[PDB]
Amino acid sequence: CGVPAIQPVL
Amino acid sequence: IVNGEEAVPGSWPWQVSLQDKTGFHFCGGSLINENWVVTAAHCGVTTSDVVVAGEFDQGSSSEKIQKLKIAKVFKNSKYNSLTINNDITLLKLSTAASFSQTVSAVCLPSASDDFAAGTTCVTTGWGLTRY
Amino acid sequence: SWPW
Amino acid sequence: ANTPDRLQQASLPLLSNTNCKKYWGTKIKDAMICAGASGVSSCMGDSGGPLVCKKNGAWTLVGIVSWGSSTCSTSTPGVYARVTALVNWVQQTLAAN
Lengths: 10, 131, 4, 97
Description:
The structure holds 4 chains of a larger assembly.
Chain A: no helix or strand
Chain C: E1 2-3
Chain D: E1 8-13, H1 17-24, E2 32-36, E3 50-55, E4 58-68, E5 77-82, H2 87-96
Antiparallel strand pairs in D: 2-5, 3-4, 4-5
Protein name (chain D): Chymotrypsin A chain C
Organism (chain D): Bos taurus
Active site (chain D): 47 (charge relay system)
């Protein structure tokens, strides 16, 4: 859980 | 979200859109595994509503979304509608989500985990950007 | 206040 | 009002319930957590979605968007269901169903 395959960019 | 920004598509893969039978987005939610979504109790979800996973742009239906039926709504019996306290509902899906690059689960904290005031977190959604 |  | 087609995000800070009470008074309960008052706000239609914080490298559900300012004021904190107060119920419900 909690580790997106497509990383968010903040 | 007021004064937020567009997300990278697919980068919040637990985020779902809860839609009514007319297709209207009324609330968000989060996948916690292939079979279950966490949302707010006050959203008033029923088994006639739909969980839409894998969405980014609700106006562009070129994406491979999963429209998941709801089998049962488990509103936390401690929810207090008067104070909006304990504002959590679990949705058990009729059809399991198929996890993928754009569909996957958020972690749950342990009951004893600590998150300090001042910590920077993130919120996501399709709520109003201006009132 | 209002539900969100 | 404006509803977006595209998913939005914002970073925002957690508040303490004691400080949140300066805004909201006795409306704040132990199963709530406040966040924002920082130039962004959750708003109508965000309810039920996530407030996530990184914990040991993983995004972890700390809040569920719940309620707040009726005009989504960016200088007032939003109120979220506090998932650490609710996670035993989640685990019990999953186990029994």
